[model samples]
Target: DMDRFIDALMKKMTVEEKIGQLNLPVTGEITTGQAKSSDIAAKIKRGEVGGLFNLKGVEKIRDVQKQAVEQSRLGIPLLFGMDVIHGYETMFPIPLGLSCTWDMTAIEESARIAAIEASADGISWTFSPMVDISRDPRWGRVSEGSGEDPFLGAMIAEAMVLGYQGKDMQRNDEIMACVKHFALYGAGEGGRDYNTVDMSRQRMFNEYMLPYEAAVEAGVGSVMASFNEVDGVPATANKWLMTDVLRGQWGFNGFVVTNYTGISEMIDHGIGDLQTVSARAINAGVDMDMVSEGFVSTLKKSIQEGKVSMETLNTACRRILEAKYKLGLFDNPYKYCDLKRPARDIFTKAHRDAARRIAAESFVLLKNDNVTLRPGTPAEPLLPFNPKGNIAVIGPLADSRTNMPGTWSVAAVLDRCPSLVEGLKEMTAGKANILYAKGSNLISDASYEERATMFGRSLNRDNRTDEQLLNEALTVANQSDIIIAALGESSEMSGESSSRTDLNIPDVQQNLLKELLKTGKPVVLVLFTGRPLTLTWEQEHVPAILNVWFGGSEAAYAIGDALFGYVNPGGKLTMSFPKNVGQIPLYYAHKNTGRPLAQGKWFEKFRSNYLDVDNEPLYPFGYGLSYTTFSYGDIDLSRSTIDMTGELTAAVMVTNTGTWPGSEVVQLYIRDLVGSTTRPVKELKGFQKIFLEPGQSEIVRFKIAPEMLRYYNYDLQLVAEPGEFEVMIGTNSRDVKSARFTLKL
Candidate 1:
């Protein structure tokens, strides 16, 4: 029915009308109380616009939709879209933090709730599930993706697609999921945003391509072209990437949309002019252009010059109409324009409670060395601090509400979100004497602070001198029994164009923290960040450190829950936390070098090792501390050998060996003894999160088929060679128990 309908519609459309379907532009002065005048109104009347994006509220989107359907030549309904990156009205943790939970169900639920909120506000498409696999912390957009592991990234990608666009797209509550930045945008050189990306096709297929392929297999409706160049061609015009690989090989039967100004940016990327590149993009695969009129303005000329074919143009137009048809947009354009759903569905208590629960789960306890609070629990981390004790909460973010909801929470009402101090006080119920102080500005330089806190995530900058701020903080630290240092990058410091060269705490905050530590008061570092910050110094000097990477709307209460022992921190890093910026682009699954450092030695001359820092990450992937210790038993194998047709099972017993109950992600990693191509030291094959009571042990099992052992060979062929393999079972990548087995032909 959709094919028949779209076929009929395409035949009736003129060249201009077909090009209009490829144009996606931002609403100009239409939703900003200036609806009386809009440049887009004339475009809508002339049928020169395809969709509108980032224009909030039901009424505004409804008004625009009416214009497109009523004033347009064909009465085509416009698609409404927004970033909706993490969550909508009820903000959740950034995507990086969400992936740390390793709870696919919870991750899916977060996207589901986001769709409910965004769709209720009249958005039918979301540019989310940014499945790019990022290993570098220097890339600001790392916060927008699942971390280094392709297996984990693929799993998260599948869950997100299912959540955003349920099995049935016709459901008004669901939205179209756009799998984004295709492909390998995260592999940018120097971890710089919008930088060039070059890698062997073998590495790309084996490592970075899994997530995007998974999203496509999971039936995502759309794809977004990345800003970076893949291989040698910019993604916006890379026909080989968009057509041969994505569609021909993987069979992604969806429309392609460009990232914001992806086509125009090609000029800066040393590609042709706007008209030339726009023609290339549409022919290559892109169906819609966002925030750039390159297609609408130049595609006609390109067509006249025979630079683009009408059939190609019509195919792109048909793809968009197919999406609308799948979204049931053609059936009823105003399906998502229900004003009542916003009040009842968006940011409801149920959604808020879920956000709080998931936020607490996303926190990773980096260090918990202080033993004063719970003196007898030597095995436990410094967390589960006593709520009845005197606690000093000091930092720029300690009392700030805006910074709680991290970057890209465009829909969140910042002032309405609670602060860390507020949640602590409420949780304690006056039982704890909580003292608060603005220890330091977000950064020492006011101008830099202003730039860091862009997009309304202000820290209420302290105009006082550094000494003045530290003096106040020291006074609070001396009076309180223990100090809770809330410090790290602000919300806007690590998302989209916020990449930083120095991966350490701001100078002023580091100084303030040093002063607090000198007071001899036990300190707990409640770090607020969106990406992994180099904490070699903090790990050495700080008594305790909890990396809470910008939990969302319920962030305050979630922090309270984890701090006061109501919940045990279970999050494991999906990205490796480097020792310093010098050791960046670090990951667990790196290829072994010929001159590798002797097992644990750091400073071996003539070896592939950093002279100043160790080869190991500060915090390895899948690393996290908990109030309860989980001890992993030696791996047990069902059989030592397997043929190409057989399977093997690895089992391990995980015990909660501490006073408190907690969850442990039982990870299964595998290493091929030899391959046609060099293999990673170890690759994460499978993982399962299991909750255990104190002293309780459970047997975790993983099945390894031939597919699990397969890797892309030098010829880019997926194969599992006959060889010995190592099976590793562990709490984290570094601390693992292993056994060896062989696979026969």
Candidate 2:
């Protein structure tokens, strides 16, 4: 039925209608009462639009979909897409925060819940699971992707695909997952968004391609072309990327849709004009044009001029039709339009509870150094807070309601969500008094704050002088037993188009933090960010730091839960937290350059080392702390030898040595000591997030096979060369217990 119905439908579609199947426009420019004379409605009636995206509400979607299914000549239903990345209404942590969990099941469940809510609210497609592998923290979209490791990124990509497209997308609650930014969009030069990316072919396949390939392998229903160029040619016009590698090598059966106005923007990429790029795009294997009328306005003319073949046009049209058919839109176009689904499925108590749990799990406890809350009191961890104290939550983010869900939550009910202070008050109830103070504006410059607080994430910037804000904050700190300095990027500070050169707490906010530290009272920095920040000062000054990366709608509650010891944070860093912005591209895996600094050395006379800072990240990837501590035993390899057909096992005994029960992500990384080509210093192969009670020990085992050691070589062939290997198992990437093994062919 997937191929047959689409073929029959294509036979009936006129050239104009076939071309219309490639046009996608946002409904914001096309909606009105009675709904007949609107520009979007008119386009649907004329078969000029294939889909309408970012349209919320079941009734609204039904009305627009009716124009395509009933009013249009062929009655071909439109695919409704939205940026339901993270969550729909009851949100989870941002993708970066979610990746920190290092828990695939939780990651998949987050997607599953998002699909249920989005599909319930009348969306069939999501431009999500943005599997772009990012190594730079300066890139704002880093918040949208799974972090630096291809193995982990690929795993999360597959989990997201499976979660969204549940059992063939055959259920009403299920929706289509789209793997995005098709080729190397993450490694944008200068860590800038939409900037051109240039790298070797070997680098592309080895590091960047796995996640997209894994999504394709997991049956992602669609793929979105990136905004940047892949090989000096824009990805939308790069046939090799969309056709040769994606379809030929990986066998991606799903259609390819462009990012917002990707085709039209190619003119600005200094490429051909609108008509020329549109023609090039279709020939390049692009199946759909998003928010760009290039295809609808020019494809037919291109066909007449013989620039684009009719077979190529038919192929693109057929893929779209096949997607609709796979989504079961042909059988029942109104499947996702049940009005009652909104009330029943969205933002329910159960959904919110799940979100709260996942959000708590997503928090990465970066530091929990001992603190002296009271004068002359014994120093102790600042978290797992004493419930009976005056807990001062001071910062711009503490009371900002809409900023909690983070960025790209376009479908969310932002204003209704709980702020950290509100959530803390609710969570604490009579047990503790939750005090809040706006320590400082998000930033000092009004215009800078405006840019950072874009898209309704206003900090409600205080017009008062910095001295006044600081004094107010200090007074609150004096009244409280301990200070929870809610600081870091406001939600808008680290998402798409919000990239920054300086990765630190805002200057004024840092000043407030310094002042708070001067109070001689324990101050816990509750950091809310979408990407890793330069926290060398905070790491040293603050007694404790909790990186709460824009926890979703339930973020306030999740934060409350973690602070009160109701939930133990075990989330690990998927991206490296550099000591400073100069180390923008720092990651756990990098080639060992020639003239490398000696081991245990931060700097040398002439080496790949910085003059002032160390060569290492402040906090390495896979690093995170818990309210409680856990210890790892040395690796016990089951005969450290494996051939192409043989296998071995490695086991580590981990124990929760702290007084409190907590979760721990015991990671397994392998180093390719010798290869045909230079490899990453270490590659993350597998991980297990284990929960253990105090003093509880469990032996976690991993089966080692040749498949885990295989890498794209000098000849670009996937090969596992017979070589010596080191299996390192530990809490994070940098710190580990090593054992040697030999891979024999």
Candidate 3:
């Protein structure tokens, strides 16, 4: 029925209107010399626009839809799209933070709640579930993706697609989910955003292609081409990638849309003129263009010039019409344009409570060192601070409410979001005193701060000198029993087009923290960040460091909950945290070099390691600290040897030994002893986040089959070679107990 309906619609469409179905311009003003948003209204009336992407409300979207259906020639309905990158209004933690939870149910629920909010606000498509796998922290968009491991990224990818699109797109609440940056956008050289990505086909198949393929397997509704190049050709026009692999091998049925201006950017990439590249993209299987009018402005002429075939144009047009049909848009053009849904569904208390709880779970407690709270008090871990005690909350992040929701939250109401001081004050009412001060400017440089705080995420920059700022902070630190030093990058510091070369805490804030540490009072670092920062200094000097990671709109209250120990921090690091920027692109799943460092050796002559620092990451992947400790017992295997058809089970006994109950993500990693090609030291295969009361224990188990051991060979054939294998089970990737097994064909 879907195919039949789309065929009938395409048959009635004219040549000009068929190319128009591929146009997806931004709904706001822009002077890019492409299709300006002001001219978009006229284009809609002339049946020259297919869809719109921006933060237009229901009423505005309804008005736009009415023009396309009532005033257009064929009366086609327009598709509504938005970034909806994380969540809509009641924002959840950023995508990177959400993956740290490692709870598939929670991750999926976040997408589900986001869809309900966005669809109610009149959006039917979202360019989300950015499944790029990155081992690099310098790339700012790393904040937008699940970190470094293909297996973990694939799991998160599948969960997100299911959550956003559901099983069937028949419901009004579900929106189409787009799996993005297809074909190695995360492995850009030098960890720069939109930079060239070059690698062997074997590496892409074995390491980076899993998450994008997983989204296809999860029945995602669309795919977004990346801005970067793959094997000397931009992905927007790469036929081997867009056609041979994605559609031919993976069987992705959804349409493909370019990243913003992705088609036009190819010119800068030295590909061709607008007409030449637009013709290449559509023929290569790109169905829609977002913010780049290349397809609409060039395709018809290209078709007449015999550069593009009508079959190709019609196929792209058919795909767009099919998506509209799937959204049930053709039957009712205003299905998502209901005027009453926004008041009933967006930003409710239930959504906010969910956001707060999820944000609490996303906070990673990196360090909880024992220190004396005051001159006379005994030393102990500084977290779970007393709500009744005198507290000093200082630093630029302490009162910045706008940065709480993190980056890319275009729909959030910034003023309504509470700040750290405000949340602490509400929680400590009639019980404790919370003294506040701005410890320092984000950095000493003034102009750099402006670019860092763009898009309404300003810290309200203080013109006061560093000496004046530190003097006020020191005064408050001396008066309080404990000091909370809030420090890190602002929300806009690490997002689209916001890459960083130095991943360090601003010098001024680090200095502010040093002054607080010298006050003979326990200082806790509540770190707010998007990408992983170089925390070598803070790790050694700070008493406690919690990577709060720009928690969503309800982040302030969530911080209050974490500080008061209402919720134990159980989230782990998906990406490795480097000691410094020099050791970036660091990860736990690296391959063994020709002359690797000796086992347990950080540095050695003629070895692949640094002269000053160790080859290992500061905090390895799958690593995080909990308020309570969980100890791991030795691993037990169901069998030491198994045929290719047989199964193996690895189980470990884990106990919560501390005084409080908490959750722990028990991980399973596997290594291939011998292969046709080089193999990683370890690859994560499975994990379980289990909760236990103090003194309680549980036996966590993982079943392994031949499918789990299969990998693409040098020639790109998926196979499970008969060989000796080792499975490691533990709290994280590095500290694991192993049991050996043999896979015989």
Candidate 4:
């Protein structure tokens, strides 16, 4: 029905209208206080605009869509999109933090809630589930993606797509999912934004391409090209990347969109000028030009010059119309304009409650040492703090509301969200005395702090001296029984254009924390970060450390809940946390060198070892802690050998050996002992999250087939070679138990 309708409609459209269907521009006067006028209206009437993005509010979206349906020559409905990355109004943790949960159902539900709220407020498309696989924490946008492992990233990608699209796009509450920055955007050189990405096709397929392909395979309706170049050609104009691989190889049926101004930016990437690059982009298979207008501005002339074929233009136009048809926009363009929806659906209590629970599950317990349950009990791990003590919450972030919603929560009402200090007080409810202090600015330097707190996330910088601020914090520390030191990057410090060369805690915050440790009071470091930070010093000195990476609107309440034994933390690290920045791109899956150091050797004369530091990460991937401990038994394989037609089953017994009841993520990894090309030491194959009572055990099993062992060879052929394989089952990558099996031709 959609194809027939779109085909008949294309016959009636003029050339100008067809070109207009390829242009996507940002909304004007939608957020600014400037008066609304004929700017966008005139463009809609002239059929020069196809869609609008970054606009919020039901009234504003309705006013604009009304013009397109009522005033345009063909009455073509326009698509409305927004960067609803994590959540719409009721914010959840950032994407990086959410991935730590390793709970696919929870991750999917987060996207579902985001769609519901965005659609209620008139948005029909979201550029989210940034499925790029990132290993470098220096890249600012790492906060927007699932971390390093291709297997976990692929699973999360599929869950996100399912959550956003649901069973049908015509459902009023559903929105089209745009799996973004396709083709190795996360592999930028030096971990910098918009940097060049160069790698063999083998590496791309084996390490970084699975997540994007997974999103495509899940039937995502759209894809956005990245800003980086691949194989000497910018992605905006790379035929091999956009067409040969994405469409020809992967069979993605959806449309392709450029990142904001992607085509024009190619000129800066050492490609041709606007007209030249614009033609190349369309020929390469980019269906829509977002914010650049390069398609509308230059494609007409390119057609005249014979640089672009009519069929190419028609193909792109047809894809856009088909997307609109799938959204049911053609049947009723104003369907999302209902005023009653927002009042009933957006920011409901149930959504916020779910956000709080999910946020708590995403907190990783990084360090806990010499902590006691009571004053006289033996020292154990520090967590689920006592509610009877005078607790001191000290840091600039501890009392601020703006930073609580994180970097991309544009729809959140920040002021209404509770701060950690406030949430602690409410959560305690007179059970304990809660104190607070503004412990140093986000940084000691004024200009640097300003840069770290952009986009209305200011910390209200104090004009006092660094010593003065520390003294104030010391006063709170001395008065409290235990100190909760909130420290790390602010919201603006790790998203979009906020990359950093040094991943250490700000110098001033470190100094304040040193002073707090001097007080001899037990300290708990509550780390608020978007990307993994260097925490070797904290691991050694701090008794307890929890990485709460920019939790959303209900973050404060969630933190309070986790801190007070209401919930046990079960999040695992998807990205490896380095001991220092020298290990910029460290991961658990690196290929073993011929001269790899003996298992525990820190240094040797002619080995791949750092002179100053060791070769290991501070915390390995798939690592997290809980109030209780889990023990894994020896791996049991169904058989030691299997043929191409048979499968092997690996089972392990996981037990909650400690006193407390909690959840544990059982991970399965594999290594191909030998291959035509070198292979990683380990690759994540599967995982399962399970709950058990104290002293209870469960047998977790995984089925391994030839498909799971396949990898792209040097010739770019995806094949499972005949070789011995090592199967590992563990609580984390570093602490694993293994079994061996062989595959025959």
- Superposition TM-score, candidate 1 onto the true structure: 0.97
Q: Model 4 off-target regions past 4 Å?
A: 28-38, 372-377
TM-score of each: 0.97, 0.98, 0.98, 0.98
Q: lDDT of all the models against the reference?
A: 0.89, 0.88, 0.89, 0.89
Q: How do these models rank on lDDT, best leading?
A: 4, 3, 1, 2
Candidate 3 global TM-score: 0.98
lDDT of 4 by residue, 510-609 (tens): 9888999999888999999999899999999999999999889999999988888788899999999998887778999999998887777877879888
What are the candidates' C-alpha RMSDs? 2.3, 2.3, 1.6, 1.9
Clashes of each: 0, 0, 0, 0
**TM-score pick, better of 1 and 3:** 3
In terms of lDDT, which candidate is stronger, 1 or 2?
1
Global local distance difference test of model 2:
0.88
For model 1, how does the per-residue alpha-carbon lDDT over 478-545 read when each residue is reduced to its tens digit? 99988899999898888888778899999989988898989987889999988889898999999889
Choose 2 or 3, whichever is better by TM-score. 3
Tens-place lDDT digits, model 3, residues 85-189: 789999899888888999889889989999999999889998889999998898888888888989999999999999899997778999999999897988888
- Arranged by TM-score with the best first, the candidates are 3, 4, 2, 1
Q: Give the total clashing residue pairs for model 1.
A: 0
